Amino acid sequence: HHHMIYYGTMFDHKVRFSIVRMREVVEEARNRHALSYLATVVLGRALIGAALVTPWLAEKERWTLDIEGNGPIRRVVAQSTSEFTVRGYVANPKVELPLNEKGKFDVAGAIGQGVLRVVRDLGLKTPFVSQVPLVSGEIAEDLAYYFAVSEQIPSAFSIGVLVDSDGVKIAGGFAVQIIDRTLEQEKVEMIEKNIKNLPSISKLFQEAEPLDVLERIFGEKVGFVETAEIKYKCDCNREKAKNALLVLDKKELEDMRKEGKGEVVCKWCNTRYVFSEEELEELLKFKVDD
Amino acid sequence: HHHMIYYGTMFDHKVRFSIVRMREVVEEARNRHALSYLATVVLGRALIGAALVTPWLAEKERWTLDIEGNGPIRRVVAQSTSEFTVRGYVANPKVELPLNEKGKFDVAGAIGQGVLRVVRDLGLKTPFVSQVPLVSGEIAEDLAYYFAVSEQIPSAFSIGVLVDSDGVKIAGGFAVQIIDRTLEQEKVEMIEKNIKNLPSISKLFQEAEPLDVLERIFGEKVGFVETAEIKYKCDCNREKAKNALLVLDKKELEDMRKEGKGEVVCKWCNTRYVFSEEELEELLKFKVDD
Numbered sequence A, B: 001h002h003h004m005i006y007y008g009t010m011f012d013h014k015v016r017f018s019i020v021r022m023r024e025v026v027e028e029a030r031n032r033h034a035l036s037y038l039a040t041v042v043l044g045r046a047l048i049g050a051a052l053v054t055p056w057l058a059e060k061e062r063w064t065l066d067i068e069g070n071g072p073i074r075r076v077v078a079q080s081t082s083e084f085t086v087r088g089y090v091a092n093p094k095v096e097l098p099l100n101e102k103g104k105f106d107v108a109g110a111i112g113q114g115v116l117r118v119v120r121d122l123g124l125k126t127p128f129v130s131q132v133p134l135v136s137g138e139i140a141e142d143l144a145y146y147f148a149v150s151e152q153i154p155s156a157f158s159i160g161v162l163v164d165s166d167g168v169k170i171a172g173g174f175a176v177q178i179i180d181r182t183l184e185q186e187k188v189e190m191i192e193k194n195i196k197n198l199p200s201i202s203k204l205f206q207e208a209e210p211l212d213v214l215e216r217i218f219g220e221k222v223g224f225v226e227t228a229e230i231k232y233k234c235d236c237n238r239e240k241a242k243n244a245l246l247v248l249d250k251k252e253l254e255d256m257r258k259e260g261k262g263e264v265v266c267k268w269c270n271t272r273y274v275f276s277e278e279e280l281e282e283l284l285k286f287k288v289d290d
């Protein structure tokens, strides 16, 4: 299953864990947005990030990771939900760069100097937003820093996307978080050591099943694990596109009407919504009557 | 002393407290900005808020409260520093509204529906920022909720500003915060009860010295207490104003040059900086020379 998260807790519930295989989801993002190889990795990592926190979201929460910087990708946005769905986008889907010195996709260079935001939308009038400076721009470590500093949850994220000309081959990772800091220091140290010892996801996920990866982290096999299916999903529809156009100035709608057509593209899933001259005339007529 | 903070901890350092009398500081904000009565109270409360957290800032921190809403004041910004200074401003210094039903200044109405932000500028590349929805728009409680939710520091703030035609008469308040949540529930309960029982600041500060107010909160007299002087202070100067003009488009500087003069007004302290035609020529000469 290449769209599956596994999750649970260890050590009398003082540690929580998440591990995901989601090449299918990242492949869908790549195709919907026609992402370059580099943009696939950057956004993929962000999507994995969002996915990994899904088990821990409140009811009907939307959780958004919003990384913004001065590198040529400019912005990376990944949203997950309590329903185990994700969606996301980058400002520059066609970004290309030389590989880094170690021959990997230059995620850090794509993002450049900037910041990481987490938006928690939990059904109050406006969402909680927390912003921190980037640590490295590799996404994993940036997100672990957010958790340590804003949420006071010591964290390790490990995340990897492997993509070639036939598409995304691996897109997965894990998250280990200390939710109760009275956890014995030797359990802390051992977890730390075991993770630091693991190969990067691209290599680890070709060699080990998710549950065996976890056994390696915790020094013993895990106990109870829950699973869920991660899906790429957006809530856009045509009604919403039409409303998007109704908020525009009369002049914009006139200009489309003389152009012969109006188009709305959903930024999250790249779905295009095309409106005819008549449909625009209808919306304009509505603008005057309202 | 009407620009003074007192601070310490109680119960084996599990609770920290802050209490401030600062009419002089709030009076100066009112004169610099030519604040209306209502804008005096709104900004004053925010300045008190910022002042109350000064003892607990990191070294060289600037801590900024930024409340933004749809009421007629629009925005309220108060910054404090590790050097026990403050500065602040509102978007609409002349705002007026009817008194609320209880005959008080309508702080909540002035702010309206909106959000509270805290910016922690601690010498990293960009600051920590945390945003929460407003709870009531009275400021004290909104700030207490920021602390409970973003910093996980259960908190009580009580804040009051009394102003008439001779100016600010009282501008003070206190903060009590649980920095170690293992604190016995009966101390928690007693503190809560004692604070809830207090009169509002406008009344209490006419009747009780700061240390006696704290005795009332904690059920016994406090122990070791530190003091500091709170001062209104800004870091603007003319060199900075000249730089502010250098960042403007050539065209803006040309228009001022034909206008005969250029003005920069510091938003924090309402100091105005006036530049002659020759000085604008100088900067322009420097625009095409850079």
Ligand SMILES: [Cl-]
Pocket (backbone or CB within 6 Å): A002, A020, A021, A022, A023, A169, A170, A171, A172, A205
């Ligand atoms: Cl995978």
Ligand SMILES: [Cl-]
Pocket (backbone or CB within 6 Å): B002, B020, B021, B022, B023, B169, B170, B171, B172, B205
């Ligand atoms: Cl006072």
Ligand SMILES: [Zn+2]
Pocket (backbone or CB within 6 Å): A234, A235, A236, A266, A267, A268, A269, A270, A271
């Ligand atoms: Zn969509």
Ligand SMILES: [Zn+2]
Pocket (backbone or CB within 6 Å): B234, B235, B236, B237, B266, B267, B268, B269, B270, B271
């Ligand atoms: Zn100034």
